[PDB]
Amino acid sequence: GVSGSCNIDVVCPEGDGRRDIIRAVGAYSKSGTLACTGSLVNNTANDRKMYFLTAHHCGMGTASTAASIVVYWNYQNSTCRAPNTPASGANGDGSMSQTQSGSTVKATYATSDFTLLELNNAANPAFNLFWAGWDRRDQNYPGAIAIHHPNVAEKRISNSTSPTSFVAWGGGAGTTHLNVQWQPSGGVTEPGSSGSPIYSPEKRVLGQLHGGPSSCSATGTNRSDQYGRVFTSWTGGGAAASRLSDWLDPASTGAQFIDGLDS
Numbered sequence: 001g002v003s004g005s006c007n008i009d010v011v012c013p014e015g016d017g018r019r020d021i022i023r024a025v026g027a028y029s030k031s032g033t034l035a036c037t038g039s040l041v042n043n044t045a046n047d048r049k050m051y052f053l054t055a056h057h058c059g060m061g062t063a064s065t066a067a068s069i070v071v072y073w074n075y076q077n078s079t080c081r082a083p084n085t086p087a088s089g090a091n092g093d094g095s096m097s098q099t100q101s102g103s104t105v106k107a108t109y110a111t112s113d114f115t116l117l118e119l120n121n122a123a124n125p126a127f128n129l130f131w132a133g134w135d136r137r138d139q140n141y142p143g144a145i146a147i148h149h150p151n152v153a154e155k156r157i158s159n160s161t162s163p164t165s166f167v168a169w170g171g172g173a174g175t176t177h178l179n180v181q182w183q184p185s186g187g188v189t190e191p192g193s194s195g196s197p198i199y200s201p202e203k204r205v206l207g208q209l210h211g212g213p214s215s216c217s218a219t220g221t222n223r224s225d226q227y228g229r230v231f232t233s234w235t236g237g238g239a240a241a242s243r244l245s246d247w248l249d250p251a252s253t254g255a256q257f258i259d260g261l262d263s
């Protein structure tokens with residue numbers, strides 16, 4: 001696939017120390033066409049349920065569209081293409097042959113733009129999946145890491161080394177979204193990246209991509225994005241079919257954050 005040359009291949013050195021969470025991310029298609037990004041999250045029962053967090057706006061929040069999903073695992077460039085060079089902006093060599101299809105909707109909520117699906121098939125050992133931890137604490141972070149499929153192309157990593165802030169969708173005063181500032185010549189996010197996770201420096205999911213003004217040519221504060229907060233989604237719409245709590249903490253531990261689980 002093709003995406004902006006400013007993006008960074010997950011196999012590059014920027015992926016060092018994050019080789020676990022990279023494996024939680026997948027790209028997917030909706031009714032046949034490539035649509036967005038999602039990723040696996042762990043839960044307090046440590047049972048490896050196929051809980052796949054994505055964005056509401058991608059439209060998989062219905063029985064009939066969730067059934068239609070095709071997930072592509074390990075879709076990434078084989079070699080590190082130097083960011084900000086023509087090679088990065090070129091067609092990648094990623095394989096889309098490790099797939100699974102079908103899922104059911106656990107919950108969905110427009111305000112924080114999240115959707116929790118459960119994939120029909122159990123983890124295939126051949127895929128070497130990872131179920132990421134999460135953090136629902138009401139706080140900001142000194143930086144963040146994005147792992148996504150820009151333009152639903154080869155998997156990329158974007159680093160933020162600026163503190164996050166709370167905003168409403170659109171950047172106005174609010175607390176439903178986390179505002180993330182990208183590096184001036186670093187990777188960003190693009191259409192297709194929606195529903196991709198944003199992780200704290202400690203590698204726990206804090207939210208998923210709603211959208212924002214960024215592109216590789218964006219400058220200043222326009223080189224940022226907004227993520228619907230796990231904190232918001234936790235209580236969500238007020239019931240199991242619109243929140244994350246029931247699903248992520250079935251064992252009722254009351255945990256504010258949890259680590260990931262390997263295959």
Ligand SMILES: *CC(=O)[C@H](CCCCN)NS(=O)(=O)c1ccc(C)cc1
Nearest residue numbers: 057189190191192194210211212214
């Ligand atoms: C849904 C997704 O692909 C994009 C991500 C864009 C990231 C750009 N830096 N979200 S969106 O913000 O394009 C968007 C599209 C439709 C709707 C209704 C909401 C937002």
